[PDB]
Write a protein of this length. Structure first.
Length: 164
């Protein structure tokens, strides 16, 4: 389940109470405690919708101790394989325009729309191979389209962990 968050760019002094109050102010529930390590932390949300809301509302938008926090899906490196999430897509963008970008990097096995309360769209894309998704991530994250900057990140690909 995509309810697990990684929180990055934290100060050395950051404490759970600091993150608790950020999530409370954003009206986002968590389903367990904040685990604060050295410059980063982990927390779970009750479901995938809340995890996405936390990313969209908090990442790069809230500062703690003078540093803007980063909030992302927590994905172990060995689960960064075929699957990506693309956020901040222009609301009216024709799906052929998006497809014309995606296929420059590989074969799209699937592209699923995700529910979100933002005006911008979110899709989960599965490429055929790890090399294709890695190139798409590098080329599409930060790409500017119709006055919107696309944000692209890995999501877990648990079933391909041993695929060749």
């Amino acid at each position: 389940s995509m309810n697990k968050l990684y929180i990055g760019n934290l100060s050395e002094n950051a404490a759970p109470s600091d993150l608790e109050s950020i999530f409370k102010d954003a009206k986002i529930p968590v389903s367990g405690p904040f685990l604060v390590k050295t410059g980063y932390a982990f927390v779970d949300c009750p479901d995938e919708s809340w995890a996405l809301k936390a990313i969209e509302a908090l990442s790069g938008k809230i500062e703690l101790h003078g540093k803007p926090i980063e909030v992302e899906h927590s994905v172990p490196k060995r689960q960064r394989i075929r699957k990506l999430q693309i956020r901040n897509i222009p609301p009216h963008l024709q799906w052929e325009v998006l497809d014309s970008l995606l296929v420059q990097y590989g074969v799209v096995e699937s592209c699923e729309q995700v529910n979100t309360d933002s005006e911008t769209a979110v899709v989960n894309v599965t490429y055929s191979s790890k090399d294709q998704a890695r190139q798409a991530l590098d080329k599409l994250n930060g790409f500017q389209l119709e006055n919107f900057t696309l944000k692209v990140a890995y999501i877990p690909d648990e079933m391909a962990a041993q695929h060749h």
